[PDB]
Amino acid sequence: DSHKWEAREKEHYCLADLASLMDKTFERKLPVSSLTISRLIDNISSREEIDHAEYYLYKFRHSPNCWYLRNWTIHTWIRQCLKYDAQDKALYTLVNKVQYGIFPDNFTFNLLMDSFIKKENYKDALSVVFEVMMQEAFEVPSTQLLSLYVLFHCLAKKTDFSWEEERNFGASLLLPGLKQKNSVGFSSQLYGYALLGKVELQQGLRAVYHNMPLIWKPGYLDRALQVMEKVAASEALDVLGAVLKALTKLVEQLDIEETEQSKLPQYLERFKALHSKLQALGLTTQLVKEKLSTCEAEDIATYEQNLQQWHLDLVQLIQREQQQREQA
Amino acid sequence: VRPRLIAELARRVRALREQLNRPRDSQLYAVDYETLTRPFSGRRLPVRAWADVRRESRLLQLLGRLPLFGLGRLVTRKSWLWQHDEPCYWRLTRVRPDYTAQNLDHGKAWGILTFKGKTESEAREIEHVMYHDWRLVPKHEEEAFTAFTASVPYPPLLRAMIIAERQKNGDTSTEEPMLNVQRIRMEPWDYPAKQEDKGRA
Amino acid sequence: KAYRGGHLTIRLALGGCTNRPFYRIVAAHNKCPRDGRFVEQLGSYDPLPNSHGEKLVALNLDRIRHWIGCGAHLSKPMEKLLGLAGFFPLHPMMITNAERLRRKRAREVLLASQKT
């Protein structure tokens, strides 16, 4: 997956020429070109130049051209991390994420993600899922591999998982639970809904839509109770979830709408009733291993179209750079 | 006649310091979250916004977590969700973010409005970007989020006057003269105006 | 005198002596003082009950119609008085001020019931 882009549209391979012109402009407070950060990025060949690029990405984010951090520039940088390590500094840049502001919502997430599994990279690979969950993604077939890893770590970590990591499972469970293809997507949706509707009566609602892209509607357990009716018209932690709620600050809710602690006999029966029909109508980690084989038809044909887009882009970009210097 | 050289020259010097070292958005828009004061102004905040400013985040510290700064995303004020069950939100067209702010925020953005199920083109500037009442509508269930389906008499002093007026005009004509309120529009007070019409202080 | 963004207002303006007020409705600016100059002088309002108990008001409505059509703002004590006149709708502050004393008397009647 590497030997395609490596015709990097050959340029200068220098750095002592470049790195002065990129902070003379900051000391004078000039706006900087959007291409010179990338030309710094496509000349890294040492681990100290990785940290040089990190300082300069930090200084490029705090700039008058705080926009124009283009996706192929990030793609060159993540190809630079794939060249050297792709073990810590890419993770640090994805986890800071505002000081640097990368955001590569592409197949670039999957290219960095699957290579973690090649060294199996558990604890360092878990965070990339946890930050792309906060992002909006998954208009791509990446839902299979994200769910693959997150159920690998479901069967690896087994606790209360934290105050908030129990919430940091659920959204990456739920938005890849848009799978109409199998009932395993509707199962991931259920396991998401269980442990995010579980924090609603534990701590409060605001923590769920604190930063992760959710919705402030307090009814989420019923949204699992209705997609299970969708299943029965077309899991076993919700059983402990609905009864664990039933066992022994700014209020947002209204005085006519009832608080959902008094409805736990209404949460027992509506859920314990329909599973008796799910019996009559109609493991997890092996299912996504079935899905890794059945799916992943490998759309690099769109990736190559983007490479063509960037070979269209940078040429007409540097044409105006040549004319801006002849205009003097 | 005496021409005022220093009194005219000083307006130029005050203009090139209202324009050059005027302080940017981070250095007059932050808030001490413990003491409820502000940097560079020091005047405390109203007590109808203490819980909402302690507890809920602002617009562009939330919306700096998206690629190309959330170029087509939907967002909605916090008390908009409390007062308006109908859809009222912002589509985005452009963000001009602050750069000097660590944990980058406090930009100026402008885009398309929707109010209570009614939207309109000609993307104007958005109000209350520094305010702590913001909540992001995610790209999941945005299609479920967007969902939506005379004549009053005159004052009695005019009622006696204009009847006598028509009786002088020639026809008594006891059809009741009515002023139209259908031509008068009834926007509420939460309705936002153009951010340009206010200036920064 | 250049007023930095001044507009018109129809206000009261005092001309009584001490402990005997005498208002005067006047079309003036927003920033010129209370007993100061104006644009047009209108029919005044005497707030004291006269012999055999009347409070006298004057309204030159043919010119009050002219000024707020020309773009005059109005004071809330003036809008109460036009509401009492019926040239305006009655003021909601006047209505709820009536209701506040009516609910105070609704309390007073229960108070008079409890002390017999």
Binding site: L254, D255, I256 | - | R103
Partner: peptide
């Protein structure tokens, strides 16, 4: 007013509230 509106204003102004009746009576002597 309907109580789905009265509850919203109560939710706005929870901690600072004065209890109240509805309409006043018809006549005051």
């Amino acid at each position: 007013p309907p109580e789905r509106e009265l509850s919203r204003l109560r939710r706005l102004y929870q901690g600072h509230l004065q209890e109240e009746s509805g309409p006043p009576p018809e006549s005051m002597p």
